[PDB]
Nucleic acid binder design. Structure first.
Lengths: 255, 255
DNA sequence: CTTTCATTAATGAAAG
DNA sequence: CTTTCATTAATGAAAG
């Protein structure tokens, strides 16, 4: 039972994450950038009702806060099913165009896997839950991601924005990847024989024996939980000799 | 009066040309070629009536002869005006595809002109009339260019074909250019100081003085007429210091 | 809903 | 009139 031995590490038990060792992020704008305020496209009541619960939860979690800002981007009503359960999707393309570019450091999967020796065949795969939301956004960079939220009868005054790294921001993957690398630097040092692959929120721990993987996984989950990250208990693939990672089937050190 | 001093050289006085020194041409087919017989698209009486006179003249001139051949290509009703005066245009693309390719030796105008010294500034431009028709076609290669000719009430039995190099045949320009080069080789030798440019049927004689151009032009016209070629008396540009050639305005050795 | 890049489908020009 | 290459105009896929 891992779900029990590591309360903090699992999203199902530790609650929403928060990377306590990471300074709130400041997002640099391009030299000539000026605020852009895109109007919110009218939203059908159905779309709005499907989205409402997610927005209320984020507000409850403090991931969204009311605000008044010169920046504004459209929120989009996106449903994966045939016509059920919506989810908010923000179009941040106009903001992305105004944010200074950074060097893409996230390695492509193929290259990331090459760094996997045939020796280590005991794998553990972890999927960090709501990775981006774990990184705080400095108050100065928060107004940048504002959007309008209407609640007819009575609700929010108008705009809401993120206090965490959001979905849709071009630099989120890279910023998260680098942040987690900084938080796990020590762990890599205390476990020289282990092999840890990081692909944004997708982690692969590789050990030589089942015992090392056991203790390796315990130490990792332990560290992640203490750092404020949360792994998905449901998706977790523990000490298997065969696992699914980045769209690959790892078996006998193949692929 | 040149129109008078050189009866044979002008199309207007010497009649249809015939390159007497040139052996009738044999057209080699590609190794795998087999005869293709494309049906004649129905022709409106108007188109047919507009074309008839040209066909009768060619038959009278012996440029077209009746024939029975496994080859056949469509004749096209083409009128340049708004809707008047037609002219026969044969679609020889299927025949062209079956004829063995030869090396394109006709030089592009730009390069042909480069070979023009600033010294020679007295020009004579000649346009050979019905150049292709001046080259005979060997009887063996004649069936290849057959087409159908209908004359309702009563006329030709069915097919007609050319006894001369025809329009529409991909190799005509090159074959004509090389043939005329062979016929004018001696003339170039007897007139070392003259500069003769050949672009298929467009000729440019360049001399140093007006007198050389006078005698140069007389000798050329004389030779052309004796060889069986015919220059256009109407278009002829004699011993001018400025002339139009290949879409260029030659003046003071410019362009 | 808008934006940007692909892939496919129409027309227009050149020719024999 | 049919063929082949261009240029332009429609749609379809990917995304935020």
């Amino acid at each position: 039972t891992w779900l029990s031995d590591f309360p903090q590490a699992w999203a199902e038990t530790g609650g929403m994450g928060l990377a306590v060792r990471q300074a709130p992020l400041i997002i640099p704008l391009k030299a000539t950038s000026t605020p852009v305020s895109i109007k919110q496209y009218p939203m059908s009541q159905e779309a709005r009702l499907g989205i409402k619960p997610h927005i209320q939860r984020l507000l409850d979690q403090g991931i969204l806060v009311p605000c008044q800002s010169p920046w504004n981007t459209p929120l989009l009503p996106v449903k994966k099913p045939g016509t059920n359960d919506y989810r908010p999707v923000q179009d941040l393309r106009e903001v992305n165009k105004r944010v200074e570019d950074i060097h893409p450091t996230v390695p492509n999967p193929y290259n990331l896997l090459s760094g996997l020796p045939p020796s280590h065949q005991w794998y553990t795969v972890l999927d960090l839950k709501d990775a981006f939301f774990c990184l705080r956004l400095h108050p100065t960079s928060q107004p940048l991601f504002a959007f309008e939220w209407r609640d007819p009868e009575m609700g929010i005054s108008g705009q809401l924005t993120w206090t965490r790294l959001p979905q849709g921001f071009k630099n989120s993957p890279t910023l998260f990847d680098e942040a987690l690398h900084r938080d796990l630097a020590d762990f890599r040092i205390q476990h020289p024989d282990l092999i840890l692959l990081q692909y944004v929120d997708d982690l692969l721990l590789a050990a030589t024996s089942e015992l090392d993987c056991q203790q390796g996984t315990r130490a990792l989950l332990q560290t992640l939980g203490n750092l404020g990250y949360r792994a998905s208990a449901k998706k977790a693939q523990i000490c298997q000799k065969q696992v699914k990672y980045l769209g690959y089937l790892l078996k006998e050190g193949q692929r």
